[PDB]
Amino acid sequence: IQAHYDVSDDFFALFQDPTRTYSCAYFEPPELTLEEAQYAKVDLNLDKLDLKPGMTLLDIGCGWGTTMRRAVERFDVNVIGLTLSKNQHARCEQVLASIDTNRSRQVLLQGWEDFAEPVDRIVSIEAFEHFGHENYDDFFKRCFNIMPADGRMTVQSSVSYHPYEMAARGKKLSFETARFIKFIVTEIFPGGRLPSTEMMVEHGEKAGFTVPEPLSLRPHYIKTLRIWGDTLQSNKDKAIEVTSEEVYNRYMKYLRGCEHYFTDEMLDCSLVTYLKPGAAA
Ligand SMILES: Nc1ncnc2c1ncn2[C@@H]1O[C@H](CSCC[C@H](N)C(=O)O)[C@@H](O)[C@H]1O
């Protein structure tokens, strides 16, 4: 009965930009539209990956396929995307099928747990918080093992802090943040779990990866969540029509709540890079 909290693609179209990106944008230049800023976040990730023409890139949690398209277009690489959504899958094939390229392009309806084919490079933008702590060793091991000697991966993920770190900020705020996080992980992304940055880093390291200092995206998620919130708000009535007032207020609280806790430095978002020992310098 986890599917009570399932919301239709229609609803998400009433807050997200045209690319249907459901992750932190990168406003650099700061004057970028959200849509521009989502392309910019995609580039930010891919440009870390030492992609060369004819490599195969893996997108773990590929959504609507925008990352994969931009990759094949910009880097002339083959792509493979993993998604758990039947709709995302059909969309992705259509998106990929339209590209003017001899490059191989492929999208699978399944998790990384079931993927074990050799790829050169890996991107994963905000799928990670769906995985669960219990699965982290197996994730970084799978990723290390499917890549060549020079492999690289980025993982972008919202992040919380260890209950120890949060107490330093005061108990009132620490229990309040804990409850909000439970909310996210229950009603927004059922079964989810926010890692901390330190977990992202150390699991990567235990698997054999070199991990430079993660990049914080916090102010960008502030701006993203502002625009997401404002957009849903301005579409209040269509939103309710497509779902319920329940669903609507649920998402307004998510967007405004995250924006608030990010502003309060109670949440973060890290773009972590994992480099195999043979990665290019
Ligand atoms: N175990 C898993 N393996 C592969 N994808 C997973 C997964 N668990 C969740 N996901 C996927 O992760 C994606 C997170 S939403 C973000 C999608 C896209 N990268 C973007 O930035 O917009 C969804 O496609 C969801 O189905």
From Swiss-Prot:
Name it: Hydroxymycolate synthase MmaA4
Q: Which domain of life is it from?
A: Bacteria
Something else known? Susceptibility of M.tuberculosis to the second-line antitubercular drug thiacetazone (TAC) requires primary activation by the monooxygenase, EthA, but is not sufficient to hit the lethal target. TAC must be secondarily modified (methylation) to its lethal form which causes growth arrest. MmaA4 activates TAC by interacting directly with TAC or with EthA to produce lethal TAC, but the methylation of the drug appears independent of MmaA4.
What pathway is this protein said to act in by its record? Lipid metabolism; mycolic acid biosynthesis
EC main group:
transferase
Pfam families from the UniProt entry = CMAS
Q: Does the keyword Zinc-finger apply?
A: no
Q: Where does S-adenosyl-L-methionine bind?
A: 22-23, 61-63, 83-88, 112-113, 125
